[PDB]
Design a protein around this ligand. Sequence first.
Ligand SMILES: [Ba+2]
Length: 352
Amino acid sequence: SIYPPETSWEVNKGMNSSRLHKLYSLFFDKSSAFYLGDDVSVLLTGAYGFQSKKNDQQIFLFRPDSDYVAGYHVDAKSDAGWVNDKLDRRLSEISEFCSKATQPATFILPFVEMPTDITKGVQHQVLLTISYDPKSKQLTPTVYDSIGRDTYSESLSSYFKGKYRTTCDEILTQSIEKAIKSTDFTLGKFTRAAYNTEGNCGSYTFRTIKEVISSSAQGTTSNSYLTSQHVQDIESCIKYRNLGVVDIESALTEGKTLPVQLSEFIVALEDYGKLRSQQYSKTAKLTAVELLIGILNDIKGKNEISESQYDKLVKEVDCLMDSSLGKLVQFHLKNLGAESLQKLVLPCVKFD
Ligand SMILES: [Ba+2]
């Protein structure tokens, strides 16, 4: 129920559902390349609801989930594959919703796509979106894929497209139809949108989620719209803060940003500490970290740092600004409104 600060995460380990959830925190950080002043909160299980400013459109964004997964068979001789019953549930729950809905909606599932034949557990973060139009009773699915490929040189010949499946599209489209077995709705043409080394897929997905929402509010890129600011945001979030799930829930339902508490800085430091002990000498950075954690706890206590503790901190300034540790300290200091550690700690100090 707590997404801890994964220092040293750096956007290539790849995403996982927890991280992605944690990234959802950015949707209402005004100072964020992912900010959404296009949606309001609305007053459907497993999804957060969003009203459109500037529109009639309704937007449901599902909480990411370790079970939102489809497994396809690369061999075409094989059964096309499977979907978790949970994803199938959500699909059905979506159609059940839409049958009663009067205002048009767009549904957003981050899910994972993977080959089951191959022993290699190649799990691919990928995005499903189902829009529903009640006047048409139309339900159009799209899958947004971040490994665009399609290279002329490494294109699958049609015949071999017969021999080999590159994606779950078969099984997925099957699952959607099953949800609609009533033949109560028209399913629009299932398209797959592709674009855009491999480990980047998930962060792309998250960006797309933003886009899909913004577009939805408004309607309707040569390269690198995954802006570095975007990446700085994602990295700093996954890497440096300590979020509870309750916090994120509350954030997305009350439409509030989630300011960085001091405890977040403290935890971040401690985790940095553990990880660093595993790998300026090591004992040096560990002494710095220790000392600093102590000071911040004493602040937390509301106690005044001793002048002595401060002078202690002053050489550790050099040791705590260095590189990685430095960037952690820098993130949090940005988010506490302090120019330096010396600045932050200078008040509430008891002088001899
Ligand atoms: Ba199933």
